[PDB]
């Protein structure tokens, strides 16, 4: 029996126990429709394993194990709800992901893996996955709660000075170097994904965009982000084609971040989605700083070093030349130790479910798979998704 | 997450690792067809597990681990072969059960339940199952080799005197009591199913007939045959209606066995099948012993006590009254020690693959499932069938 139990044991293996449970659990859902039960063999199968399957679903991991405290986000695929695992009394942030909606129409995988290789790295710059489970209608992702909110809410609540901008930019740079060292590139760095913890220190979150690189250090996918205020030219060019951009697409985003933090608006803002795309494409000519908004030459120099063609953009020789940039001189922190210095904005958190750093959200009614006639097997793409710390 | 791992661990459970691996392996077998793979979900799933599945199938116990010494039986569902496990060098008998011929004849069940009840109870009176597994075409049951042949062979080689018949009947009685105690009725007691071990002692074998009982100990259906000469009148009338029978059908078969063993022919023999059925329905009238063929007044008595209507048949008030019949007097064996006394026929056996107590066999075949055009799940009914000690 030698190697068999070992393949089942390895928690990274695709045929460990919780994958076998996912598999059998999915197969049941794809066969329990009163059309398919006309088949002799399908009916007998369900009649035996139906009972014990619901007993499993009871013991496994379920939305009922958690209390919905408040809704802190949405979502387009689901919600971001502040939850308290009743058994552990612990607080988490849970992202619901509608399946069906998760069928972005062409090719998929496996799918997760990006989030897998992040969790198994446990960087303190990346919002951390603890548990991940599913039912018939949703994928569930249980993350560490970030009670300081995102940097959208921060910039809308403060006039960010350059002393703060150094700090938040530096921690983003250290987070991107962390993700890049895992073999991934983010492709969606924006203030929505920059989240602050108990102490006002920043972590990056993956909203499903991170991708593992070539052996050329490239990625070439297809799959989008919708609004482009923070997206580089090489990514926009490639949505039509494929089209191989490197890790330096993320450093463009840092430049956009630093512009918005010091200026008040994004560099290529426009009413229309079109106008922003065309303005980003025309960045050699469209980028400019407002007449008033006073900005140090060092800061203005760094922004422009990030917002150029990816041929000459700052940081495609490695991250070291980002750290050397004069804008990052300060009396308060070293790159060596910044995550244990004092943050500029420490949140005033009064309890462990304080969510005052998250805007309120209305109650919006969900859409799902069509009931099939013949076996279509909608659930097979999620065999292996369930994950336990 | 407590007694979930209890469920998978326990090999009594219907969803241990074997059932989960059976589950996955069937899911792949039923889905890998060029027709169904126009579906993207199904193709995506297969591309992920296809490879690692063939790996398991290789690791798992499989028909190649066994050398085939000789075919000793057959077997409308497949042959019975004397095999030798290559790693353990041990000798077993292996039944093959064509999956195609198993679904047709009949519904449904389960099945292999009976045999789990029998395996995990492990009576020395019942042929012992050791391993059980499957591939795409066949089912496989590895049992202990019974090198002394069946009692059809014995009765055809020896004029059996009464002192021998006392022994063999006694062991059939103790064996049926074991099976009955387990909540099973055999429904198929006949010399074919009575096999002799190295020492000349007797065990019963299930040929897929044993059935699990009532809350009292008496359940119905048919299904079924037993086998024409040995069927009780209640099983024969039972094809609907007020048709319902318990353990007392096996005790009819004991009496038929004792008639043949002492007379040389079955009590209700006939050229046609319908001749035997009509004699059995007319058993108050058709049973009679050849005047010459000498039968002690006790052997006549026991036979006639078994061969009557079910409500006056020996064994309705339990087995204890079968044991104190005047026929079972002897000086050789008690009822608590009989299986450690001298059997009347010990087969001298030259090696551990001697098969001289089994006739020769041959004549090729093979035949399996029509290729599906959509999903039909022809491998679903066998999920959970894999068994190991």
From Swiss-Prot, chains A, B:
**What are the Phosphothreonine sites (modified residues) in this protein?**
386
**Active-site residues per Swiss-Prot or TrEMBL entry:** 188 (proton acceptor)
Q: Where is this region: Interaction with NPM1?
A: 347-389
Protein keywords: ATP-binding, Biological rhythms, Cell membrane, Coiled coil, Cytoplasm, Cytoskeleton, Kinase, Magnesium, Membrane, Metal-binding, Nucleotide-binding, Nucleus, Phosphoprotein, Serine/threonine-protein kinase, Transferase, Zinc, Zinc-finger
Q: Which GO terms describe its biological process?
A: actin cytoskeleton organization; actomyosin structure organization; aortic valve morphogenesis; blood vessel diameter maintenance; cellular response to acetylcholine; cellular response to testosterone stimulus; centrosome duplication; cortical actin cytoskeleton organization
| Location in the cell | Cytoplasm; Cell membrane; Nucleus; Cytoplasm, Cytoskeleton, Microtubule organizing center, Centrosome
Can you list the GO cellular component terms from the UniProt entry? Answer: centrosome; cytoplasm; cytoplasmic ribonucleoprotein granule; cytoskeleton; cytosol; nucleus; plasma membrane
Name one molecular function that GO assigns to this entry: small GTPase binding
Tissue expression: Expressed in the brain (at protein level).
> Where, in this chain's numbering, is ATP bound?
72-80, 95
Which segments constitute the Protein kinase domain?
66-328
Q: Which residues form the AGC-kinase C-terminal domain?
A: 331-389
Record note on modification: Dephosphorylation by PTPN11 stimulates its RHOA binding activity. Cleaved by granzyme B during apoptosis. This leads to constitutive activation of the kinase and membrane blebbing.
Oligomer and partners: Homodimer. Interacts with IRS1. Interacts with RAF1. Interacts with RHOA (activated by GTP), RHOB and RHOC. Interacts with PPP1R12A. Interacts with EP300. Interacts with CHORDC1. Interacts with BRCA2. Interacts with NPM1; this interaction enhances ROCK2 activity. Interacts with SORL1. Interacts with PJVK.
Q: What does this protein do?
A: Protein kinase which is a key regulator of actin cytoskeleton and cell polarity. Involved in regulation of smooth muscle contraction, actin cytoskeleton organization, stress fiber and focal adhesion formation, neurite retraction, cell adhesion and motility via phosphorylation of ADD1, BRCA2, CNN1, EZR, DPYSL2, EP300, MSN, MYL9/MLC2, NPM1, RDX, PPP1R12A and VIM. Phosphorylates SORL1 and IRF4. Acts as a negative regulator of VEGF-induced angiogenic endothelial cell activation. Positively regulates the activation of p42/MAPK1-p44/MAPK3 and of p90RSK/RPS6KA1 during myogenic differentiation.
Q: Record's domain comment?
A: An interaction between Thr-386 and Asp-22 is essential for kinase activity and dimerization.
> Which family is this sequence assigned to?
Belongs to the protein kinase superfamily. AGC Ser/Thr protein kinase family.
The name this protein goes by in its record: Rho-associated protein kinase 2
To which species is this protein native? Answer: Homo sapiens
Q: Which gene encodes it?
A: ROCK2
